[PDB]
């Protein structure tokens, strides 16, 4: 009621999720799951603590540290820690709510949570960050553990911070266990850490194509437009290049890079690994603009994004940050001819893009339509590997890169089929119309979580 | 000298084990596993706690809750919880002592325990059961854990109740871990786990039959008389039909329903799934008889047992409850060819109907003799999957129904091979005589546990 | 300003405290205690959890439950729980921050903390409250203890509720210890615990007359007007009568109660126990004012406060709720001849009323000026005794009513001496002007706490 | 119901409690206290566990250990450990139930509990007992604590064993804390502890029926019958000389020690210390009856009891073995003028003797019925000083004999006043008549406990 304060980014996330249930037959054939709706919307535990850390030059500095522990029906709480100046409880509760159902769809026993702080890594030495991670871990220590809550990273996967965190836990608790995810190979790491959300997203589009076009086309000779030039985007280019598709695009913070002749060219691995190499030393495509290998068949577009500027390309993978896509760019990926999109980043496409594509699929059918596949289905591939790493640490063994990838594949194929089938179950599409992935996926995630909490006595 | 409390169901168990050891050449190799007897028969710990809860009409209801943790040399304590008005520490110690050696024979690392309450589910709503399970788990919390004691379901405690239990533990201890067995698939559950006991009897009998045949016969064209129409019995009525035998009966708490022609007539899976579907409403077998499908192929028996009414049958699968075999009905099948009777019903027979089969085994030479099989061999199938589920929750994964069955096979074939081959060593049969299974099996499980307890310094 | 949630009631609390420091020479002697200001203003640890419980009709209910653990430099976290529909992090932080300095001034080793939920006792039966308290301690248990957080009662939470809390603690943790305060006498109770709130107020005020007038006036023949008829107000209506003054009036929220002759008349214990008697069956004052025993010597004033309708009164003791004196009535009290006011209840006088008194204190000298002493000076009656009860439970003894009151007295005597002298230490008034107790008390509470926090290495 | 096993001496304990309550006006004012009646029958937690230990000839032992934790509303569970061959859960439940209410009456914060083993120290060397106590306090450590359950010594457990128990705890838990009672002074021992159990019983009689006499019978000038010459019985004589009485009798094993002059000489302290001296080496009294100091002032009859031979006594103290009163030894007492029987030992009176005394109590006036002093008023002194000793160890200090006696006095005055007042409160006597004190006592302990457990929501 009235006392319930402002957390806007959560409130709209709740409505959009409730809306999927309301715009379906689930709630028509389960009016007890309404009694569940309100229970889960409140997180099972939230913690907030003061984080004090001495800086370089030796001065006392105070920030706020957090960990939202949203749901635990499926498994131990699973999530990520995000260090950004704009962090409050509102954004992480939002992120925590999404995490619940994403972990549901992986099929691994994992709960939902999110945390971190309002610390800005920019203008901080790795030595100041060290003492911060120590001091963060010090007062989260008691609310986490391997069977209870296993945090991770968010805004960009580097294990540098995960390194500092796990060290302080071991020094406190006298224990070596999977308390954190995204660990280095030497100290309890997964191989296929770097290719979790990137390689995984392409597989879904592979799974997309075959069902959707009923197997007369595949990634073979399809041009794919990616945003971002980072961890997600390079490894998400490469699986397309593996399947004899083509990488049309690349993008960064001071401009985009597109191939000039939009039908018959791409970014080769060799071309990608240079921008991989540049981005580790904090370079752009302003540092790559003259190159003999790049200049002759490419075009830098400064200050701009790769949706509208690409002329004709048939997949979209926004893999930089959230809200890179706006309404302006959204329908541009309808007039360009693309029938396939998932957000390789977290919430990369706006609510306008979201509203746009599902709204098209609502009232247009067959081959004509673009299919926006949800983050909780496509972008699930990071957090599954994280679970498979927790599973590795539990087993106390390390897996072959192929064995981890083999399972990653199977998780995404079932995740797609679950959303697909759950859509047809409840939001039965009209003949010609593709099933709803935002609906299938949300209902598929909500029913697993809901049904579990019925049999765990959290609602009755 | 007789200072202890009178415990009539445990004393029944005690003779069975001791007598088998005495009627064997154990002590002709090993007289120090004699003194073992007194150490293990005393439990490591017994818990008993008052449970207070509320009924639907808002009143106080006060009940007694229990947990015997008998032995743990081989692994964490493992055991079901049973809610029945006649339960006390006498019965739980009894059931607990049997559990020890059954888990031994699986080869998994599992101890022996048993618990539950004297609460009667009958009359009580699923809503009242909820608040009771909460209040039961609330005290038990402190005496259990995934490496210490992992309980399960039993008479009147099902996955619905195991749901309620697991939820309260997680809410108390702030962890997601395999504290219970028989969990739902989505929250740490095993496939085959509800349907393991019934595969357990059949597979055991097949290899039991084979050593009888000395490698020549199977359920192929064998008529089987099954009692019980619950979890064990239906899937054991199916599983014989899977290998090519025939089901000439099934039964419940009212009485039995059987085919006309007990030489070459049978049920079908479709007819079994009819009983399966209907019994989950607690609805009777008398109700099946007047359908189109039943009346003209069958006869219901108003208030009978189905041993005396099947005629020429050699196979008996008593998969209802304890004391569902009596001497009268046993002899009725001895002239009809009863050469096989394994027990999934943990204790389908008592002191009278133990004896007669062992006495038959020592005369009617070869396969002409009866092989009455131990509870610690056949019904072990269910409790194996419990261990494989603990193994899955350790690994933090789920295995496919097939993969779990594949391993379950090995446990049952090795269990028989252990008892059979140990019997030949100690209860050496005369040529013409089948080896002694209630000897082999009891000696097999008891010696491993005694041997471990010597190495763990619990006896010297 | 901008990454912070907006929490008004806390900002005012922090402002008034920062303001007192700014209007003072603390920072002039010690400019490192700015670093001290900012660290403690962020709480060390805050907890928020979902509270699920059941209503009369067996309906599921959801609330949000909290416990802010603000500071613990002085001792274990101490502070009440509040059950009110309005409850949110703004109010709990606010109440939590203030608690820190009040505990400082008691001298006892107690930190600051506050918690509770958005449970409304109104329209809940003792039976629903019971089942709520069952489900509340359940998720707080892990964050508290006698040597960590020791909560108490507050708006909506009484010893009856603290009863239900303490029962679940014993049930979940096999521990019986002083985890909560305001317990019944037989099960870890203090004497004067039911009496403290009223008695404590008077003692503090008693010193004020004596210092100010330098022992030339006392409670003999001074009119003291009480608002409220609560626990707090009755023992302050008795304690003035004990010391030889006269009780002008009593009140609640359907109208005040006054004597006919407001210059010489009082209440009597017999007439107080009637109002005590009515409040236990939740009967108001309007309901009693008809009596032959009452109506002949009093006049009921419906719907109105007793501050402007006293006219001639010399001491004023807010003993009801928050903001139960407004500026109008505060200035009105100045014109009537009231010279002393201190909040026996929580947060009685407005900051405007205070500042109206603060303006008067600055411009009048000797006895002549009105002295508002904030709540953290007089209301420590109930919070000091809480510590003395924890001390009793630690010693595992009971002290006599007299012995506990004797100490309670001395704690208020030292609290007055601290605030008085700390005012003169930093904020020396111009000679003849009375010392500032908003300044003395806040500086006295801040500096001791900061000094602890400095030497415990949490600021430097 | 039907499952309850046969549990005798607890039914007798429960009967005597329930019956007393049901024969009173408690239930005229308290109708909900039937809901209370059913809760307290069932203990909150009981653990019953295997002890293995080792003997001097290298032989393995199995012996059985118990610890009933009956109720803890008032304080931590309190109750001694007893090593007696006849121990089962029947006797420990019985002793446990009584202990609850005995602690209640003292007003110290103590729950009820009881434990120990069926091990007989007789025949065992202090070396075998040592290794047994080690092995006992290997497996009970986890179910006790100073804040959880505080055991003590009893039949077969002495300070030697208390040392051994506490020593093993310290090796496990790395803690020095008051787990146990009757410890040496230097390592947590209280300075009236051996001289508390006796002094307390006499004090009660000093006022017990004296309030009837309207404070006219100082514990001077009373003729006494003492049955026992042990710790409790000896020290019940040392205080008597202080108060101005004269003791005629005592008793041991083979025979009795009763005076020639039944109306004349008491024992001297030096004469008592003579009996005390031989009881360290278990040397009997027959060895001192042949000496000039005692042989010429006493009369020994081997194989008789000390009830009637005196001829004339005004008190009876069955403080020897478990039961040393018969039908024939139970009416002459009435004819001699003994009106103040004061049960020293547990179950000291026979139910037939009692039922002569119950008949006498009903047929009389107020100061010269044979007022039987209950199970839980007289020996309360023994367990009371335990609650000062754990309190001393908590405070980390040792108190002088005077200070411990000073409190012992106040405990006994309130204990008497509770029984006294609770009798008159509920079992209001007819004018002239003495009340029932076993009814005062039974109602007094049960109402306090019920009151706590009502407030803690364990019954409603």
Q: Find residue C168's DSSP bridge partners.
A: none
> Which one of A93, A114, A222, A239 is the catalytic residue?
A114
Strands B60-71 and B45-54: antiparallel
Q: How many Å lie between the alpha carbon of D148 and the closest alpha carbon of chain C?
A: 5
Q: Answer for the pair B42, D64: CB distance below 8 angstroms, yes or no.
A: yes
Task: Say if the Cβ atoms of D390 and C396 lie within 8 Å.
Answer: yes
A-chain CB neighbours of B170 within 8 Å are 72, 456
- Looking only at Cα atoms, what is the longest distance across chain C? 67
Residue B325 backbone phi and psi in degrees, to 5:
-130, 125
* CA-based nearest residue in chain D for residue B35: D60
* CA-based nearest residue in chain B for residue C56: B58
C-alpha D316: how far from chain center:
15
CATH of the domain at C223: 3.40.50.720
Q: Give the whole-angstrom CA distance, residue D195 versus residue D211.
A: 25
Task: Say if the Cβ atoms of D62 and B42 lie within 8 Å.
Answer: yes
Q: Give the residue numbers of D marked as catalytic.
A: 114
Q: Which pair of structure tokens corresponds to residue D328?
A: 């024939």
3-state helix, strand, coil split of chain B in percent (to 5) is 45, 15, 40
> Which one of B15, B29, B93, B114 is the catalytic residue?
B114
Closest CA to D262 of D325, D317, D209, D307: D307
Strands A62-71 and A112-117: antiparallel
C-chain CB neighbours of D147 within 8 Å are 175-177
C-chain CB neighbours of A33 within 8 Å are none
Task: Say if the Cβ atoms of A109 and B159 lie within 8 Å.
Answer: no
Provide CB contacts within 8 A for A204, sequence distance 6+: A342, A373, A377, A378, A381, A412, A415, A416
Sheet with C371-373, strands from edge to edge, namely C246-247, C223-226, C315-317, C340-342, C371-373
Q: Answer for the pair A103, A78: CB distance below 8 angstroms, yes or no.
A: yes
Closest CA to C231 of C168, C154, C171, C316: C154
> Which one of C15, C93, C114, C376 is the catalytic residue?
C114
Q: Answer for the pair B188, B389: CB distance below 8 angstroms, yes or no.
A: yes
Residue C183 backbone phi and psi in degrees, to 5:
-90, 160
Q: How many Å lie between the alpha carbon of D363 and the closest alpha carbon of chain C?
A: 36
Name the strand (E) or helix (H) holding B112.
Answer: strand B112-117
D neighbours by CB contacts (3+ pairs under 8 Å): B, C
| Residue bearing tokens 């309260």 | B168
| Residue bearing tokens 């080690």 | D134
**How many CB atoms within 10 Å of residue B339?**
22
Q: Which pair of structure tokens corresponds to residue D305?
A: 């009891």
| Residue bearing tokens 């613990």 | C72
- Looking only at Cα atoms, what is the longest distance across chain D? 69
Q: Answer for the pair B231, B238: CB distance below 8 angstroms, yes or no.
A: no
Angle value at C-alpha B346, between B340 and B350, nearest 5 degrees: 75
Q: What is the 3-state secondary structure (H, E, C) of chain D?
A: CCCCCCCHHHHHHHHHHHHHHHCCCHHHHCCCHHHHHHHCCCCCEEEEEEEEEECCCCCEEEEEEEEEEEECCCCCEEEEEEECCCCCHHHHHHHHHHHHHHHHHHCCCCCEEEEEECCCCCCCCHHHHHHHHHHHCCCCHHHCECCCEEEEEECCECHHHHHHHHHHHHHHHCCCCCCCCCCCHHHCCCCCHHHCHHHHHHHHHHHHCCCCCCCCCCCCCCEECEECCCHHHHHHHHHHHHHCCEECEEECCCEEEEECCCCCCCCCHHHHHHHHHHCCCCCCCCCCCCCHHHHCCEECCECCCCCCCCCCCCCEEECCCCCCCCHHHCCHHHHHCCCCEECCCCCCCCHHHHHHHHHHHCCCCCCCCCCCECCCCCCHHHHHHHHHHHHHHHHCCCCCHHHHHHHHHHHHHHHHHHHHHHHHHHCCCCCCCCCCHHHHHHHHHHHHHHHHHHHCCCCC
Q: Give the whole-angstrom CA distance, residue A16 versus residue B293.
A: 51
**How many CB atoms within 10 Å of residue A346?**
19
Does residue B93 carry a catalytic annotation?
no
| Residue bearing tokens 């099948």 | B333
Task: Say if the Cβ atoms of D6 and B3 lie within 8 Å.
Answer: no
- With b meaning 16 or more CB within 10 Å and e meaning fewer, what string describes A202-234? bbbbbbbbeebeeeeebbeebbbbbbbbbbbbb
Whether chains A and D touch (3+ CB pairs under 8 A) is answered by: no
Please tell me whether residue C26 adopts helix, strand or coil conformation: helix
Name the strand (E) or helix (H) holding B149.
Answer: strand B149-150
Q: Answer for the pair A453, A73: CB distance below 8 angstroms, yes or no.
A: yes
Q: How many Å lie between the alpha carbon of A86 and the closest alpha carbon of chain C?
A: 6
Name the residue facing C395 among D145, D394, D456 (closest C-beta). D394
Cα radius of gyration rounded to whole Å, chain A: 22
- With b meaning 16 or more CB within 10 Å and e meaning fewer, what string describes B195-232? bbbbbbbbbbbbbbbebbeeeeebbeebbbbbbbbbbb
Q: Answer for the pair D13, D351: CB distance below 8 angstroms, yes or no.
A: no
Beta strands in B232-312 (DSSP E): 246-247, 249-251, 256-259, 298-301
Q: Which domain holds residue D359?
A: 195-377
A neighbours by CB contacts (3+ pairs under 8 Å): B, C
Closest CA to C313 of C243, C224, C241: C224
Q: Does A76 touch chain B (CB under 8 A)?
A: yes
Q: Answer for the pair C178, C199: CB distance below 8 angstroms, yes or no.
A: no
Q: Answer for the pair C338, C314: CB distance below 8 angstroms, yes or no.
A: yes
Q: Answer for the pair D305, D312: CB distance below 8 angstroms, yes or no.
A: no
Q: How many Å lie between the alpha carbon of B178 and the closest alpha carbon of chain C?
A: 20
The reply to whether B231 sits in an annotated binding site is: yes
The reply to whether B114 sits in an annotated binding site is: yes
D-chain CB neighbours of B43 within 8 Å are 48-50
* CA-based nearest residue in chain B for residue A104: B186
Name the residue facing A455 among B163, B168, B174 (closest C-beta). B163
Q: Answer for the pair C330, C356: CB distance below 8 angstroms, yes or no.
A: yes
Task: Say if the Cβ atoms of B397 and A391 lie within 8 Å.
Answer: yes
Q: Where are the alpha helices (DSSP H) in C337-369?
A: 351-363
Q: Answer for the pair D393, D177: CB distance below 8 angstroms, yes or no.
A: yes
Q: Answer for the pair B320, B250: CB distance below 8 angstroms, yes or no.
A: no
* CA-based nearest residue in chain D for residue B46: D48
Angle value at C-alpha C231, between C225 and C235, nearest 5 degrees: 55
Angle value at C-alpha B351, between B349 and B354, nearest 5 degrees: 60
Closest CA to A81 of A204, A199, A169: A169
The reply to whether A424 sits in an annotated binding site is: no
Q: Answer for the pair C54, C97: CB distance below 8 angstroms, yes or no.
A: no
Method: X-ray
Q: Give the whole-angstrom CA distance, residue C174 versus residue C169.
A: 8
Q: Give the whole-angstrom CA distance, residue A71 versus residue A90.
A: 16
Q: Does D413 touch chain C (CB under 8 A)?
A: no
Provide the 8-state DSSP code for B6: P
């Amino acid at each position: 009621m009235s006392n319930l304060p402002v957390e806007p980014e959560f409130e709209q996330a709740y409505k959009e999720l409730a809306s999927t249930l309301e715009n379906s037959t689930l709630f028509q054939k389960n009016p007890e799951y309404r009694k569940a709706l309100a229970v889960v919307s409140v997180p099972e535990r939230v913690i907030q603590f003061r984080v004090v850390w001495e800086n370089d030059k030796g001065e006392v500095q105070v920030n706020r540290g957090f960990r939202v522990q949203f749901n635990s029906a499926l498994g131990p709480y699973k999530g990520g820690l995000r260090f950004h100046p704009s962090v409050n409880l509102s954004i992480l509760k939002f992120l925590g709510f999404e995490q619940i159902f994403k972990n549901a769809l992986t099929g691994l026993n994992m709960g939902g949570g999110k945390g971190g702080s309002d610390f800005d890594p920019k203008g901080k030495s790795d030595s100041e960050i060290r003492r911060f991670c120590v001091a963060f871990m010090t007062e989260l220590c008691r609310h986490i553990g391997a069977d209870t809550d296993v945090p991770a990273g968010d805004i960009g996967v580097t294990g540098r911070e995960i390194g500092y965190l796990f060290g302080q836990y071991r020094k406190l608790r006298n224990s070596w266990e999977g308390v954190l995810t995204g660990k280095g190979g030497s100290w309890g790491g997964s191989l296929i850490r770097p290719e979790a959300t990137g390689y995984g997203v392409v597989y879904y589009v592979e799974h997309m194509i075959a069902h959707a076009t009923n197997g007369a086309e595949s990634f073979a000779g399809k041009r794919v437009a990616i945003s971002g030039s980072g961890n997600v985007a390079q490894y998400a280019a490469l699986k397309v290049i593996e399947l004899g598709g083509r990488v049309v695009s690349l993008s960064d913070s001071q401009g985009s890079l597109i191939v000039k002749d939009t039908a018959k060219d791409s970014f080769t691995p060799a071309e990608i690994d240079a921008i991989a190499a540049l981005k580790v030393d904090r370079k752009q495509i302003a540092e790559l603009v003259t190159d003999a290998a790049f200049a002759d068949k490419f075009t830098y577009l400064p200050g701009q994004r790769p949706w509208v500027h690409v002329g004709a390309v048939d997949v979209a993978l926004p893999s930089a940050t959230q809200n890179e896509v706006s309404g302006e760019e959204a329908q541009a990926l309808i007039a360009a001819g693309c029938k396939f999109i998932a957000e390789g980043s977290n919430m990369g496409c706006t609510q306008a893009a979201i509203d746009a594509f599902e709204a098209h699929r609502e009232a247009n059918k067959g081959a004509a339509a673009i299919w926006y596949a949800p983050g909780k289905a496509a972008n699930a591939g990071g957090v599954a590997v994280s679970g498979l790493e927790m599973a590795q640490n539990s087993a106390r063994l390390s897996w072959t890169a192929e064995e981890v990838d083999a399972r990653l594949k199977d998780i995404m194929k079932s995740c797609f089929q679950n959303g697909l089938d759950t859509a047809k179950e409840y939001a039965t599409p009209a003949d010609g119309i593709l099933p709803s992935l935002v609906t299938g996926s949300n209902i598929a995630g909500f029913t697993k979580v809901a049904a579990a909490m019925k049999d765990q006595g959290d609602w009755w």
